[PDB]
Point group: C3
Chain length 269, copies 3
């Protein structure tokens, strides 16, 4: 139960709906705390195998309203980064300021053909936040990140897709069905512990200085999964001509050799 | 005043013109010192809100002529990296050897349809320089970087654009107008301190191991800009139906919590 | 001489052929040791100036059969990473599981129009290996890496090329000729020491936190090559209207200021 979001779980898929639509879902202190609580709920709910984030009304999110000195956007961004479930943004409308910076830590961005995007910070005399200086170059590459943040231009879904911010474009009526089809295909076919480990190694090894770091972690991951009941279930089911019902859960069966919840310290100098 | 460059400031835009055209603007010791001095001038001139780099004559730059044991190309590359203004390359002609490696630290590459590019080092029995082993993978990605440096092939503007070295292609007469329209749109719409912080965080956080690093810096940046006169000017101007005249300057008003001029030590082992 | 591979050297090009075709070249303990030995041979053979890896029969490689607790895939991946010669994958058929993760450390991926690819780990209750959590984001970028590993979908050559896993697509009969034309153009035109240094700096500086790291190494590399006989041979040959016959070799003439064979320690916690 939230004031700034709707939250629904159906068919193994959580939908978090940004829900201040009279304000084009403008981001507030409470949406920040609530989105952190939404991801705590999705990480803990074994019935959740994928998460869709979308906007109510016309917009996705048009921007921010008006020893934790921490940017609110960043707190959400860092929470999603250490998320254990697939996260898909279904961008239905304007995603401006923190409204676009919030999507960069999500795993897959789908956009309505109506969607608009703008890193408008420099036009307002402020700066890109939500750790977008880290995320944005790893989605669209440095040159595009610099051009969008320098001009602060509001650009089309078509530019978003050509420059690689969004995976694919959908008719307004087709967006959530598309996000759902991806979410359900993961929920149907993949073992939730394997998905959670994959998510964490891909995101975390993007900042690693050498593939040795990945080799050390992914050696321990494949050793642990190799001895798991999920691997056995995968064998049985193929032989017995049936869809696997992976039994191991993100809530209990996450391998203990690595703290999937860990993050470096927030310290000011 | 320079021997190897022209330097002009009009309408908030600096144009640095590589200017040894009888030698296809071949890079020399003096062009190196002069380009460092050109960026010192652009960083210090509050009338400069964007920088265009271009070539005189037929070529952009066809290559190098013939306890600082430092590659000259790198010295320029590292100077641009810690630059505080948007830098756009307008590649008018051949950009060979250090002539292409010099553009990779710039923020946006525009090319004439006449432009040609070649990382020809290995064909001459030498090696890619100007820290291109760091920059080139972050523009075009590792596989393309390897292929261009292995073959040393001189390739077309069209390949440059398809593989992502250049943002866009222009008729020879359209190149500088296009570079100018981008430069003027930044100079017109964005607060110079916000642009300078954005530039530095995007480039610097591309080497950061985790988004926590960006969150720490961009929390301090948004706190500082939040209390700035630029933010106020942005409010006034919207209400009073007028273009903002951001008053804070890169020369004085750069926030002091981070040394924007800092770089790691050059030490030989 | 190998049981799981064919190995041939012609015209300066080594071809390593994955060769358990009755098993769609499934990866085994012995293919792992043999591929390490194949790269030791290619690194030491000055007659080898480029390496092509390809599959026998219908498939490239359909997956794994069935205080070094090290993933076998990773051992190959890490060996290729510290390889000194250009490595091109010619993907002739299905490349599933470790069959696709093995290609990511190679320098250039060419695919037959018949080729298929799938990161199917999560569908089998296991996890992406061969340090693919490091390599895959640096080939196709994080969002695509996440989508392929979450769904475990087997996808077409066309998707592989559009999302940037493969450089180019070839008719089945055209694949090895294309891989050869690239290999021979390197073998013909580039100095082997320059190629080996380039390979190592591009791959290693992709994990470096700042371009200063590249500037330090590439300053020493260009100083050393500047005094080399290859550079002289390059001068003579241009004047004397003839193709250079670079005399310096990867076996003897690798500059000594950096250990090209070095890798960080494999240690379990």
């Amino acid at each position: 139960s939230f004031e700034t979001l709707r939250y629904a779980v159906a068919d193994g898929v959580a939908t978090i709906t940004l829900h201040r639509p009279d304000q084009l879902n403008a981001f507030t202190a409470q949406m920040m705390h609530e989105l952190i609580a939404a991801f705590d709920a999705t990480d803990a709910d074994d019935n959740v195998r994928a998460v869709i984030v979308t906007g109510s009304g016309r917009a996705f999110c048009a921007g921010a309203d008006l020893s934790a000195h921490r940017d609110g956007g960043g707190r959400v961004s860092l929470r999603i980064f250490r998320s254990l479930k697939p996260v898909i943004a279904a961008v239905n409308g304007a995603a401006v300021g923190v409204g676009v910076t919030m999507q960069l830590p999500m795993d897959i961005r789908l956009a309505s053909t109506d969607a608009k995007f703008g890193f408008v910070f420099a036009r307002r005399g402020i700066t890109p936040e939500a750790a977008s200086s880290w995320f944005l170059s790893r989605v669209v590459g440095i040159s595009t990140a610099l051009e969008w943040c320098y001009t602060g231009r509001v650009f089309s879904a078509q530019e978003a897709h050509e420059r690689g911010l969004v995976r694919s474009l959908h008719a307004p009526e087709d967006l959530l069905p598309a996000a759902q089809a991806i979410a359900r295909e993961i929920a149907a076919n993949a073992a939730p512990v394997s998905v959670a480990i994959s998510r964490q190694l891909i995101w975390r090894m993007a900042g690693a200085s050498h593939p040795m770091e990945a080799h050390k972690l992914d050696s321990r991951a494949i050793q642990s999964r190799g001895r798991s009941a999920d691997v056995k279930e995968g064998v049985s089911a193929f032989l017995e001509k049936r869809p696997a019902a992976f039994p191991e859960t993100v809530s209990h069966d996450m391998p203990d050799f690595f703290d999937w919840t860990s993050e470096p310290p927030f310290i000011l100098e």
